[PDB]
Amino acid sequence: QKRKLQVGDKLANRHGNKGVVAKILPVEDMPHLPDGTPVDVILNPLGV
Amino acid sequence: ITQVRKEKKGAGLEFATPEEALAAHERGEVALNAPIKVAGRETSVGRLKYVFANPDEALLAVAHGIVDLQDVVTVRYMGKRLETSPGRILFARIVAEAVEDEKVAWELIQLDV
Amino acid sequence: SKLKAPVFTVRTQGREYGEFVLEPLERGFGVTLGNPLRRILLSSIPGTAVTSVYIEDVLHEFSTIPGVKEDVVEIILNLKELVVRFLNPSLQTVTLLLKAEGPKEVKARDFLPVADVEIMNPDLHIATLEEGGRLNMEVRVDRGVGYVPAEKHGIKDRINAIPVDAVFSPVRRVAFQVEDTRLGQRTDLDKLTLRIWTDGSVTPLEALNQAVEILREHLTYFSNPQ
Amino acid sequence: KLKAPVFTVRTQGREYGEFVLEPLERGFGVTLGNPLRRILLSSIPGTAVTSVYIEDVLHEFSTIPGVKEDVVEIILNLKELVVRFLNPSLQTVTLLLKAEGPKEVKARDFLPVADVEIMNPDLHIATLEEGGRLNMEVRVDRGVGYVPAEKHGIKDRINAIPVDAVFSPVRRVAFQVEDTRLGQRTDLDKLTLRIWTDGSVTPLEALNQAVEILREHLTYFSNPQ
Amino acid sequence: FGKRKGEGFGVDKREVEVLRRAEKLGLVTPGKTPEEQLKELFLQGKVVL
Numbered sequence: 001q002k003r004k005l006q007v008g009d010k011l012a013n014r015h016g017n018k019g020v021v022a023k024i025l026p027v028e029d030m031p032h033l034p035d036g037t038p039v040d041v042i043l044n045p046l047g048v
Numbered sequence: 049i050t051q052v053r054k055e056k057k058g059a060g061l062e063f064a065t066p067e068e069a070l071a072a073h074e075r076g077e078v079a080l081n082a083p084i085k086v087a088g089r090e091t092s093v094g095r096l097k098y099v100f101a102n103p104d105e106a107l108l109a110v111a112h113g114i115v116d117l118q119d120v121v122t123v124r125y126m127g128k129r130l131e132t133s134p135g136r137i138l139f140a141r142i143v144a145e146a147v148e149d150e151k152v153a154w155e156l157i158q159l160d161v
Numbered sequence: 162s163k164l165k166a167p168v169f170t171v172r173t174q175g176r177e178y179g180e181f182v183l184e185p186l187e188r189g190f191g192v193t194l195g196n197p198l199r200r201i202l203l204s205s206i207p208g209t210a211v212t213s214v215y216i217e218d219v220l221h222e223f224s225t226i227p228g229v230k231e232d233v234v235e236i237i238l239n240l241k242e243l244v245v246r247f248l249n250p251s252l253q254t255v256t257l258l259l260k261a262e263g264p265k266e267v268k269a270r271d272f273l274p275v276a277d278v279e280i281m282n283p284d285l286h287i288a289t290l291e292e293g294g295r296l297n298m299e300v301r302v303d304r305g306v307g308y309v310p311a312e313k314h315g316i317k318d319r320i321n322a323i324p325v326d327a328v329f330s331p332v333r334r335v336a337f338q339v340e341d342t343r344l345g346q347r348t349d350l351d352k353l354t355l356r357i358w359t360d361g362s363v364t365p366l367e368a369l370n371q372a373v374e375i376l377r378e379h380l381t382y383f384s385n386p387q
Numbered sequence: 388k389l390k391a392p393v394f395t396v397r398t399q400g401r402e403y404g405e406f407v408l409e410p411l412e413r414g415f416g417v418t419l420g421n422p423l424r425r426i427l428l429s430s431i432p433g434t435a436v437t438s439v440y441i442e443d444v445l446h447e448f449s450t451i452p453g454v455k456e457d458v459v460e461i462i463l464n465l466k467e468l469v470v471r472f473l474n475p476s477l478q479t480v481t482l483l484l485k486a487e488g489p490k491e492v493k494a495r496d497f498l499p500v501a502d503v504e505i506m507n508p509d510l511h512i513a514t515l516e517e518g519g520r521l522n523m524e525v526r527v528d529r530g531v532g533y534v535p536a537e538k539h540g541i542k543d544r545i546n547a548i549p550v551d552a553v554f555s556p557v558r559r560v561a562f563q564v565e566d567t568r569l570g571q572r573t574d575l576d577k578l579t580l581r582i583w584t585d586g587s588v589t590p591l592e593a594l595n596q597a598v599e600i601l602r603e604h605l606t607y608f609s610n611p612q
Numbered sequence: 613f614g615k616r617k618g619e620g621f622g623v624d625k626r627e628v629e630v631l632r633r634a635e636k637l638g639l640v641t642p643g644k645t646p647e648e649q650l651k652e653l654f655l656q657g658k659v660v661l
């Protein structure tokens with residue numbers, strides 16, 4: 001099976017910040033740069 | 049939204065009339081939320097410049113960008129002339145509408161913190 | 162595969178509040194429609210407001226009048242609550258004269274009637290006069306949109322006239338909500354509820370119709386390239 | 388008050404365009420730009436690969452003799468294929484590719500089809516080694532949004548492989564608001580829309596379709612109940 | 613940002629508002645041009661979003 005990222009899948013970086021995907025947004029809903037580039041992942045600053 | 053902004057551009061500076069303080073703010077001498085004294089009372093430009101008749105007017109000014117939620121202004125609410133920020137007034141409306149009782153919600157919150 | 166046209170349901174009580182629901186909508190179109198309408202509703206609906214006040218024997222806004230409980234600021238605050246509707250489309254600016262003697266509780270109805278000028282809230286309280294107090298006012302009402310602070314327009318008809326913040330917008334508050342809804346096997350659909358508060362000069366339905374028409378007119382501007 | 392704003396169009400080929408709408412009242416830079424950007428990024432119809440059949444291949448988890456890339460990588464390359472339908476009534480086309488090694492098969496190696504144009508002929512598809520052959524039947528459909536293969540599940544043949552379809556021809560949308568002035572008022576907005584597309588649909592066409600979608604949605608606030 | 617200048621685009625109205633709040637938070641130096649203040653935010657790893 002070819003598994004795509006879905007809600008409930010666990011993501012983590014190398015610094016111990018881990019979490020499950022709780023929401024998958026369409027591209028037009030994501031925060032974007034003034035040049036129009038949307039971000040890919042939104043992390044809560046309260047985890048730092 | 050409930051914390052109020054504090055400025056230091058013209059803090060501690062004294063004027064003689066409320067119009068003089070507003071004129072200094074136009075030239076950039078004093079900031080909007082800088083603590084100042086008009087005659088003998090500690091106030092700020094925002095409290096004098098922006099006197100809103102109701103929370104709706106204060107939040108309409110926020111929607112139009114005249115003031116931020118954290119700027120201290122004058123708002124007439126509950127029949128009282130409050131020297132508060134629109135965000136603190138906005139928090140009061142959140143409680144008032146959630147409990148569907150404006151007078152009880154007023155007694156439930158601490159507005160000035 | 163295109164979605165069926167949504168149903169526009171209205172829940173309007175009185176002349177100052179109304180709820181409007183549009184469903185079902187494609188994913189993200191509740192936000193796509195709600196935000197532009199809210200920005201137009203709060204800044205573009207034509208309305209009237211008090212932009213200048215003249216009171217006899219008053220020099221500055223931060224003073225008081227001997228013979229009335231309310232100081233100048235409180236009356237100015239009460240005047241910003243005044244809702245007036247012009248009955249003549251060509252009419253642009255009127256002045257309302259108020260001459261009351263104490264002991265009286267001055268209301269909005271005490272203003273002198275002007276042709277093609279209607280006071281929507283004649284029960285609005287203006288000032289409370291004690292015996293011996295004379296109150297003379299000449300308030301200037303303009304036509305405009307949105308919110309204009311007194312300093313950013315500075316309109317004075319005569320000397321000693323006090324500019325007042327102009328609440329031109331008849332809409333008092335806009336709150337729109339987007340909820341997840343479904344139609345059969347489709348689950349990412351949007352349900353948009355628009356709640357509009359108005360001062361009563363226009364209906365919340367009329368405010369929505371004007372806001373939609375304004376957005377429609379701006380969409381026609383993307384024509385005739387260069 | 389303000390008259391009709393002047394609409395200026397600047398296009399760089401078929402893939403980039405700038406659209407300037409000035410002067411505008413305060414706040415209509417965002418009021419117009421964002422709804423169009425959301426519609427441009429989400430609801431603009433286009434074409435995408437929905438299914439691929441390769442001879443002697445049963446599923447996408449296999450390799451082809453004489454072919455460097457596995458079927459997963461070939462499908463990934465096919466997801467970047469940009470196909471322009473010159474006929475508005477064309478809804479489905481099948482592109483045939485028959486290649487023999489040694490060659491670097493590109494998007495230009497598909498057989499020509501009437502009213503069908505490949506916008507990126509230099510797109511690399513597979514690397515053929517000597518003795519390797521690639522006989523593919525790539526189906527291109529017309530649609531909107533992002534439809535994963537698990538949803539549509541289109542298979543024209545028994546061993547056809549459904550492909551996740553990204554139909555949106557719009558790659559990126561940005562809009563810019565400048566401080567323009569007219570007369571004695573200086574709080575006016577200058578709105579500039581920047582649209583990047585894949586070339587099958589031009590930025591001007593995408594903008595017109597986005598405006599029509601918003602205009603149609605505005606008619607839904609009629610017939611109150 | 614230099615690519616933006618060549619394309620014929622200045623500073624966004626929205627960026628100006630964020631820069632105005634940024635100096636009230638002490639994140640940018642008052643009195644500098646919007647380009648310089650945007651660079652100051654960038655050196656802190658922050659952009660107008």
Ligand SMILES: [Mg+2]
Pocket residue numbers: 096097098099311326
């Ligand atoms: Mg004032």
Ligand SMILES: [Mg+2]
Pocket residue numbers: 434435466467468469553554555556585
């Ligand atoms: Mg594509």
